[model samples]
Target: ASRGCADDAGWNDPAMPLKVYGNTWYVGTCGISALLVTSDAGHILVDAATPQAGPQILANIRALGFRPEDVRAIVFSHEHFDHAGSLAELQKATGAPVYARAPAIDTLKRGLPDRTDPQFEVAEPVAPVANIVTLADDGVVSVGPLALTAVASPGHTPGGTSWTWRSCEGDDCRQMVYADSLTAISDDVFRYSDDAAHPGYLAAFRNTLARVAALDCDILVTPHPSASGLWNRIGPRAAAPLMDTTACRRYAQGARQRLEKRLAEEAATS
Candidate 1:
């Protein structure tokens, strides 16, 4: 309810940075989640903290010695609570454009306080709108040394989307910046959607999962901490690929099974 960070057990454990096979940085949540990446061209930050922590997030990033003004773009998930928490303030601080799926424009304009859930929520308007880069169904942003492939993955919200950033780690490797664009949704959201088996959202979610499975990545960046935190918490093999691996495919499958099983169980009771 109060202003808080976005992480929980993901940080306390020893296991973390779960799926990194390349260069990356996780600005410890201390409960709040924020990921920083230093690419060859410049530095890019994933989701910043909630607005209450805006000054701190901006200050912390500046304190890191890199010019916060160099923060060229700020990518946001579909209109959700946790991912875009400090959108308004961050835009003002950096003067950077807010990159997102076109569908989210209306939602973003609604303001952070207007997001789905504000209590434990981290969301804001796409307004005070810095340069709004409305990603095409498949938009790519190639600025400096960053190659980001933006995909439209709508399930959480219509304009819900994600960015897949590409770059090399040391010399001969590739990396991807997977936004909270799509978790195992088709595999996970059916229970709540009465139309899960229907033609609309359920089908769309599956399509997105296929695309996620097809991604060639060396590392992954998620909005939440626990998803990536498993790396440090689990044993060597068990924990390593949690975030970076396309295991999101497996998560998709598992999510499907979990959703189906839950629905069946619900039916049994009904």
Candidate 2:
């Protein structure tokens, strides 16, 4: 497999939650990430981690002095179980509408990862949710005082999505981006070069890379925070200076190279 796999100790460890910027806070575990964005109207949560990791996320939210039930809406980066596993329970707890693209909605409602998912065999299926809102490309989701723009970035999954919003601390405002996973990882048997089951998946993956690279990200928050080297800048209840405006482009460049390497591997095998 041409991917990095982290066991429970690597990504599933418990990490203290911390505020990333003005209104955005990281509530996910050491492995995956779940974010809480607060406003006067209520709160918005991004990603739900695995089913086993879901309630712990709630505890992390409470640890941060925020109410779990106050979440106004739940949005996700994709439909992978690692990200959307506890969505059913989270929706029940907050009574918040789950917003997703049509493809992701189908995967969630089916309680399984899309068959096209490279890791479908390992993807955890969850209980189907009743409340779901389908979002269009570039559609906006408004909750209380915050507005999130849905950026349709697919590759990791057919309906992979990313979110962008501006969070301000007084006159100092920054572009906050919760970018999706850009890894071209899949099961060993999967190939991105050509898939009869998924006709245009490779093209979509390339497009998704470009789409994310062009985003104006000041504070880069990824689906996996550590993927963007977030820990290097974070201390106990402290954050590093947000000076790298080109982090998104840098991230995309890495993904692009990985994609090229993956294709090369496929070519060698073929």
Best by TM-score: 2
RMSD per prediction, one decimal? Answer: 6.2, 4.4
Please give, for residues 149-259, the per-residue lDDT of candidate 2 as tens digits. Answer: 999988888888989999888899999988899898887677888767789998998999899899998988777867777665554423556547998899989999998
lDDT of each: 0.54, 0.83
Worst 10 residues of 2 by lDDT: 1-10
Instruction: Compose the digit string of candidate 1's lDDT tens values, residues 1-270.
Output: 232233364232222222233434544344445655555566666665554556656656655555567777776655654456677777777777777776667566665433222121434343345456777878766547765667776644556666676555467565554544444332222343456333376566666656655666555555554454433433343434434455555544554565466556656653
Q: Which stretches of candidate 1 lie above 4 Å from their native place? A: 1-23, 28-32, 39-42, 112-130, 179-192, 196-199, 230-246, 265-270
Q: Lowest summed-lDDT stretch of 10 residues in model 1?
A: 10-19
Best by lDDT: 2
